[PDB]
Amino acid sequence: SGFRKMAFPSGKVEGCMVQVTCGTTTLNGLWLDDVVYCPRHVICTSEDMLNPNYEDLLIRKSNHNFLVQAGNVQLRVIGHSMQNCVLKLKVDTANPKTPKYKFVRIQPGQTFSVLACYNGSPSGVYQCAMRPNFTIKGSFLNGSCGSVGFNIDYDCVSFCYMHHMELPTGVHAGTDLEGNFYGPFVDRQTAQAAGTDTTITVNVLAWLYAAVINGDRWFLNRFTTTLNDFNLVAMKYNYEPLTQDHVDILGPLSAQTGIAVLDMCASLKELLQNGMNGRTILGSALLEDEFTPFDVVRQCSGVTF
Amino acid sequence: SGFRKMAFPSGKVEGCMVQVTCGTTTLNGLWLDDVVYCPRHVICTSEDMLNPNYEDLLIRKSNHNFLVQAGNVQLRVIGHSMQNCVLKLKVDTANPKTPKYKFVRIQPGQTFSVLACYNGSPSGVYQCAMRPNFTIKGSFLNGSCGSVGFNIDYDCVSFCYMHHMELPTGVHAGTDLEGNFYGPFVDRQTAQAAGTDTTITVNVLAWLYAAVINGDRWFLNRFTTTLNDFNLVAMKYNYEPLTQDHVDILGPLSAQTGIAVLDMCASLKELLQNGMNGRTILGSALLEDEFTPFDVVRQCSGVTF
Ligand SMILES: *CCN[P@](=O)(NCCBr)OCc1cnc(N(O)O)n1C
Ligand SMILES: *CCN[P@](=O)(NCCBr)OCc1cnc(N(O)O)n1C
Ligand SMILES: [Cl-]
């Protein structure tokens, strides 16, 4: 037993990370089959960032201006194109370590692992969630641009995030692997502020089920509630409204524990109204919301890849 | 920027994980060069666990009783021996994916990554610390026995932990890769209780420096303290006493931020005496102590492997 913030094993993706240089800018790219994916602002000078015209800047670039390096060996670029906010660099060699993979666009509230890289080399791995305001709370230093987020279903990596920028508030914004930003953000250095960081209610409930499975029980009470009454409390505390779809998705955790979903909502209600009174739940003094119901079942079941 | 609980990339170790079966017990082993390492209780029946005599139980086992499987392909066992609490199974094939590696025995307060596995297959990765009472707070289900903990220094994996058992309190105990348990624990199903889980003071201070570097500043005050006066407060709150060696190790973080170590101790003092008053630091409502000073510098610098 025990319950931890856990990332997927990173080996399958480590073998896909390369370094991309255009002019004086170096960041990371993702090498799958014979295509390397990277953020399009690799072509920008720091000046260009105030107001870049990416089509015009691309006119000045040729295949040989994109220096792609895989470990110690250089890849030959034989074509390049822009798809939304990413560049796709066609190389003459298929990545021999290409895993089975898919490109997915995730919904807010879903979780994924990030492999932070610098200069095409991995630095660490950690677990993130796509926030309701379409930011993520990551760890990205200079050179980390182009790191990707992913999930693994057995042997197939589903890529969902590529890192592009940090906003003045210290949170992070990026694209799916088709180059479309999550949320309203744009790859320009300008005034864009994140909206309300609401809490992912269904995830908090999954985590409370996880705590019960792992011996932390003190927060279970004698009460129940209804969706409409709980949601009045969720509104006040900037929690996502809970829907019947969320209730349904929590069914398996309800069954394993014998605690009805609405009973656990009543526990969450009291926790929001009274606080934790200095106590902890699974080693946290706040309510964690970056575990999905599927994450909990997975970790409490021992699924492998 | 941003600061996250980060594990090392797991690929180098994924390529070392195999499945070991003896009789009706299956767990994980670590395949380096032509030796597979695994917990010795793989030879035990559930009955034997009340009071096992490992030398006598080993008499009944031969090379061919240890079934070692690497992915879908079987390894041939050509020798076996017991070193303390691990078995070393000599196989006829050197692991072609063996990384540069070392076996290290870590000190309490040090941190490391765990690759949780079941049946020789990775499930996830997360970051741990060796607690002052020589337990770790992990996530280990049935079949997770034999998962290892490690650090990576550039290209060399330093293995420091192998998982053996869970104690009735839900915490975890294991060995170094020479088979010697951390702390006083023994591989028998019996009454062994963990001591006081004291907080790793030097790590909490590193993390406060990390917060300052990342914009969380509200806890800085106008006070300072001395080692002897701070330690009176540490004693009361079950914190490790702070030494001059710890102060020295925090020097680089002191220099980067311009905050003297003892000034930050005064901040920690007030946090212990007054609490966080409902506030948060780097997204936590308690004081985190599983980041080392080296972890912080690493993550705030972008070191790669
Ligand atoms: C990976 C982000 N690149 P960077 O230039 N430097 C690391 C910041 Br910790 O971040 C700023 C940036 C890059 N691109 C944009 N953009 O698309 O406007 N921004 C803001
Ligand atoms: C990896 C631990 N094996 P397990 O038998 N089953 C998973 C528990 Br979540 O744990 C109990 C165990 C195994 N070996 C010992 N021992 O050496 O006494 N114990 C307590
Ligand atoms: Cl917390």
Curated annotation (Swiss-Prot), chains A, B:
Cytoplasmic side: 1-305
Catalytically driven reaction(s): TSAVLQ-|-SGFRK-NH2 and SGVTFQ-|-GKFKK the two peptides corresponding to the two self-cleavage sites of the SARS 3C-like proteinase are the two most reactive peptide substrates. The enzyme exhibits a strong preference for substrates containing Gln at P1 position and Leu at P2 position
Highest taxon of source: Viruses
Location of the active site: H41 (for 3cl-pro activity), C145 (nucleophile)
Effect of L205V: In strain: Zeta/P.2
Effect of K90R: In strain: Beta/B.1.351
Localisation per UniProt entry: Host cytoplasm; Host Golgi apparatus; Host nucleus
Activity regulation remarks: Inhibited by pyridone-containing alpha-ketoamides compounds 13a and 13b. In turn, alpha-ketoamide 13b (tert-butyl (1-((S)-1-(((S)-4-(benzylamino)-3,4-dioxo-1-((S)-2-oxopyrrolidin-3-yl)butan-2-yl)amino)-3-cyclopropyl-1-oxopropan-2-yl)-2-oxo-1,2-dihydropyridin-3-yl)carbamate) inhibits SARS-CoV-2 replication in human lung cells. Inhibited ex vivo by michael acceptor inhibitor N3. Inhibited ex vivo by compound 11a and 11b.
Quaternary structure and interacting proteins, as annotated: 3CL-PRO exists as monomer and homodimer. Only the homodimer shows catalytic activity. Interacts with host FBXO22; this interaction promotes the proteasomal degradation of nsp5.
Protein name according to UniProt: 3C-like proteinase nsp5
The species this protein was found in: Severe acute respiratory syndrome coronavirus 2 (2019-nCoV)
Span covered, complete protein: 3264 to 3568 of 7096
